[PDB]
Design an enzyme around this catalytic site. Structure first.
Site, PDB file in Angstrom:
ATOM      1  N   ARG A  56      39.140  83.375  41.681  1.00 53.30           N
ATOM      2  CA  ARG A  56      39.092  83.727  43.126  1.00 53.30           C
ATOM      3  C   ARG A  56      39.876  85.052  43.404  1.00 53.30           C
ATOM      4  O   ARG A  56      39.285  86.048  43.930  1.00 53.30           O
ATOM      5  CB  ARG A  56      39.634  82.592  44.025  1.00 53.30           C
ATOM      6  CG  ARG A  56      39.196  81.155  43.729  1.00 53.30           C
ATOM      7  CD  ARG A  56      39.977  80.032  44.494  1.00 53.30           C
ATOM      8  NE  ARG A  56      41.464  79.990  44.307  1.00 53.30           N
ATOM      9  CZ  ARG A  56      42.208  78.889  44.170  1.00 53.30           C
ATOM     10  NH1 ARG A  56      41.662  77.661  44.199  1.00 53.30           N
ATOM     11  NH2 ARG A  56      43.525  79.004  43.986  1.00 53.30           N
ATOM     12  N   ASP A  76      36.605  87.142  31.350  1.00 50.55           N
ATOM     13  CA  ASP A  76      36.981  85.808  31.665  1.00 50.55           C
ATOM     14  C   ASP A  76      36.358  84.859  30.685  1.00 50.55           C
ATOM     15  O   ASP A  76      35.114  84.856  30.579  1.00 50.55           O
ATOM     16  CB  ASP A  76      36.533  85.406  33.081  1.00 50.55           C
ATOM     17  CG  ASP A  76      37.128  84.103  33.512  1.00 50.55           C
ATOM     18  OD1 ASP A  76      36.740  83.036  32.922  1.00 50.55           O
ATOM     19  OD2 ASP A  76      37.979  84.128  34.419  1.00 50.55           O
ATOM     20  N   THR A 108      45.260  85.788  35.531  1.00 45.05           N
ATOM     21  CA  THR A 108      45.131  84.649  34.567  1.00 45.05           C
ATOM     22  C   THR A 108      46.305  83.729  34.793  1.00 45.05           C
ATOM     23  O   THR A 108      47.399  84.149  35.231  1.00 45.05           O
ATOM     24  CB  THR A 108      45.162  85.048  33.013  1.00 45.05           C
ATOM     25  OG1 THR A 108      46.434  85.580  32.643  1.00 45.05           O
ATOM     26  CG2 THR A 108      44.175  86.075  32.616  1.00 45.05           C
ATOM     27  N   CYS A 135      50.490  91.169  39.122  1.00 38.56           N
ATOM     28  CA  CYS A 135      50.794  90.376  40.226  1.00 38.56           C
ATOM     29  C   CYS A 135      50.490  88.872  40.041  1.00 38.56           C
ATOM     30  O   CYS A 135      50.394  88.118  40.988  1.00 38.56           O
ATOM     31  CB  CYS A 135      50.118  90.892  41.534  1.00 38.56           C
ATOM     32  SG  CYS A 135      50.703  92.441  42.103  1.00 38.56           S
ATOM     33  N   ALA A 136      50.402  88.424  38.777  1.00 41.08           N
ATOM     34  CA  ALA A 136      49.958  87.113  38.468  1.00 41.08           C
ATOM     35  C   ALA A 136      51.122  86.233  37.949  1.00 41.08           C
ATOM     36  O   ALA A 136      51.603  85.360  38.645  1.00 41.08           O
ATOM     37  CB  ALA A 136      48.840  87.248  37.448  1.00 41.08           C
ATOM     38  N   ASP A 161      54.902  92.557  40.221  1.00 43.16           N
ATOM     39  CA  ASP A 161      55.380  91.568  41.195  1.00 43.16           C
ATOM     40  C   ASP A 161      56.177  90.420  40.516  1.00 43.16           C
ATOM     41  O   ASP A 161      56.881  89.698  41.122  1.00 43.16           O
ATOM     42  CB  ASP A 161      54.232  90.998  42.010  1.00 43.16           C
ATOM     43  CG  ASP A 161      54.647  90.210  43.220  1.00 43.16           C
ATOM     44  OD1 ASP A 161      55.496  90.788  43.969  1.00 43.16           O
ATOM     45  OD2 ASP A 161      54.155  89.101  43.454  1.00 43.16           O
ATOM     46  N   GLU A 166      63.231  85.769  36.500  1.00 45.95           N
ATOM     47  CA  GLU A 166      63.278  86.194  37.936  1.00 45.95           C
ATOM     48  C   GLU A 166      64.537  85.668  38.629  1.00 45.95           C
ATOM     49  O   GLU A 166      64.740  84.500  38.647  1.00 45.95           O
ATOM     50  CB  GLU A 166      62.051  85.702  38.628  1.00 45.95           C
ATOM     51  CG  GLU A 166      60.824  86.475  38.222  1.00 45.95           C
ATOM     52  CD  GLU A 166      59.559  86.060  38.934  1.00 45.95           C
ATOM     53  OE1 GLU A 166      59.659  85.167  39.831  1.00 45.95           O
ATOM     54  OE2 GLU A 166      58.450  86.570  38.545  1.00 45.95           O
ATOM     55  N   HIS A 184      58.502  89.264  43.562  1.00 41.66           N
ATOM     56  CA  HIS A 184      57.511  88.189  43.628  1.00 41.66           C
ATOM     57  C   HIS A 184      57.040  87.893  45.079  1.00 41.66           C
ATOM     58  O   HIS A 184      57.101  86.788  45.577  1.00 41.66           O
ATOM     59  CB  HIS A 184      58.107  86.940  42.953  1.00 41.66           C
ATOM     60  CG  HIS A 184      57.103  86.020  42.341  1.00 41.66           C
ATOM     61  ND1 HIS A 184      55.811  85.874  42.764  1.00 41.66           N
ATOM     62  CD2 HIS A 184      57.264  85.108  41.360  1.00 41.66           C
ATOM     63  CE1 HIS A 184      55.209  84.947  42.054  1.00 41.66           C
ATOM     64  NE2 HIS A 184      56.079  84.447  41.233  1.00 41.66           N
ATOM     65  N   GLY A 186      53.691  88.164  46.099  1.00 42.94           N
ATOM     66  CA  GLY A 186      52.277  87.968  46.205  1.00 42.94           C
ATOM     67  C   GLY A 186      51.800  86.962  47.251  1.00 42.94           C
ATOM     68  O   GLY A 186      50.700  87.112  47.769  1.00 42.94           O
ATOM     69  N   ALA A 187      52.526  85.897  47.468  1.00 39.86           N
ATOM     70  CA  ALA A 187      52.161  84.857  48.452  1.00 39.86           C
ATOM     71  C   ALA A 187      53.004  84.992  49.737  1.00 39.86           C
ATOM     72  O   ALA A 187      52.948  84.122  50.605  1.00 39.86           O
ATOM     73  CB  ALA A 187      52.346  83.444  47.825  1.00 39.86           C
TER      74      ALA A 187
HETATM   75  N1  9TW Z   1      42.585  81.506  28.107  1.00 35.55           N
HETATM   76  C1  9TW Z   1      42.473  82.297  29.167  1.00 35.55           C
HETATM   77  O1  9TW Z   1      42.471  81.866  30.331  1.00 35.55           O
HETATM   78  C2  9TW Z   1      42.328  83.770  28.922  1.00 35.55           C
HETATM   79  C3  9TW Z   1      42.600  84.397  27.714  1.00 35.55           C
HETATM   80  C4  9TW Z   1      42.420  85.751  27.575  1.00 35.55           C
HETATM   81  C5  9TW Z   1      42.027  86.474  28.661  1.00 35.55           C
HETATM   82  F1  9TW Z   1      41.886  87.825  28.558  1.00 35.55           F
HETATM   83  C6  9TW Z   1      41.743  85.871  29.846  1.00 35.55           C
HETATM   84 CL1  9TW Z   1      41.200  86.794  31.161  1.00 35.55          CL
HETATM   85  C7  9TW Z   1      41.917  84.526  29.988  1.00 35.55           C
END
Ligand code: 9TW
Ligand code: 9TW
Lengths: 195, 195
Positions: A56, A76, A108, A135-136, A161, A166, A184, A186-187
């Site tokens: 998303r 992905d 991810t 930012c994940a 982020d 942290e 941090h 992001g939210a």
């Molecule tokens: N396992 C994962 O969710 C995974 C591993 C490598 C990647 F580049 C991405 Cl985008 C996801």
């Protein structure tokens, strides 16, 4: 989810901040300086954005950055290439993504497969001067490798982020002139907070 | 023209920096702080952006910011409503724009009619907490009135690429915590420079 758009918007902000050095230019103005040569930047239009993680948040990033004329590619492990094509992201194997990107953003979870997803091996396969956004989750980008790539110019800038610890105790990344950062956030919007 | 996108991209950057305080957050992190409450921000999605000046730049801003879910309204005395409609900008008389806007951006020349287009009288007709961008020409936003609006909270933040005098000798705007600034970087990209 309820916070997907907050996250996506901070990520897009960070991309723009990297293209134009807006946080560095503000600091420079605040220090009394007027340094125009120092902050020559780049246009996003026509550049390639690689998006690792096409859930998303990644999808929302993509459609926003498509409006700026960026070419959006990505990867992905679950989402099929026809499905990603339907929101304008061209899927390619990881090994094909690295040399094409002007910008990389990660969206991810933090798993063994994604911890140090960007590391010395994958930075060396990137185009010299790539710009990186995380930012994940802290640790998706190996912080040691990122610092080495900033020091060599292999990475021209990073926006973080999130950090492996942290608040971060090792300050070498945060203190780098080409790194922009947030605690941090992001939210951290009134809307995500207030369902 | 050749620089329209560079200008537009900086403007959108500045809008995102105002929503999320990315420059202030970077400075905070660089000073070793971790100030998450301080930098609670807002989402762009669902907010109204008023675009004063609906030429090339203003149009480019509008279509970028529409991808974030902003409602885009505006005014231009010389662009027809039908032309602006073709790029999703509802034209309204100025008096109707002020109270609607969460953000206002200017994309006009500096003329007697646009000098202090945002001044004490027009600030007082804005929604409390409006955020303002000027990446066009120094003096479109009256600097005195902007400082007064920042001091009362009538204006929650401003992003300025341009000043009435360059570099600005009065530092009260540049030094304000809710002001982000750049040393007139709107056309400073490799792409705009290198036709
Ligand atoms: N396992 C994962 O969710 C995974 C591993 C490598 C990647 F580049 C991405 Cl985008 C996801
Ligand atoms: N005279 C002008 O060009 C002019 C005057 C007022 C405005 F709000 C705009 Cl966008 C342009």
């Amino acid at each position: 989810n309820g916070n997907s758009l907050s996250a996506a918007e901070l990520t897009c902000g960070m991309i723009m901040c990297l293209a134009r050095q807006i946080p560095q230019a503000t600091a420079s103005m605040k220090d009394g300086k007027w340094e125009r040569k120092k902050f020559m930047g780049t246009e996003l239009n026509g550049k390639t954005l690689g998006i690792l993680g096409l859930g998303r948040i990644g999808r929302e990033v993509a459609t926003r950055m498509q409006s700026f004329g960026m070419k959006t590619i990505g990867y992905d492990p679950i989402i099929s290439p026809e499905v990603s094509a339907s929101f304008g992201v061209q899927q390619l194997p990881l090994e094909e993504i690295w040399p094409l990107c002007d910008f990389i953003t990660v969206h991810t979870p933090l798993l063994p497969s994604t911890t140090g997803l960007l590391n010395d091996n994958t930075f060396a396969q990137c185009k010299k001067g790539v710009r990186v956004v995380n930012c994940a989750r802290g640790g998706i980008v190996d912080e040691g490798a990122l610092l080495r790539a900033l020091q060599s110019g292999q990475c021209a800038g990073a926006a973080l982020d999130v950090f492996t610890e942290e608040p971060p105790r090792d300050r070498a990344l945060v203190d780098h002139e080409n790194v922009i950062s947030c605690p941090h956030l992001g939210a951290s919007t009134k809307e995500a907070q207030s369902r």
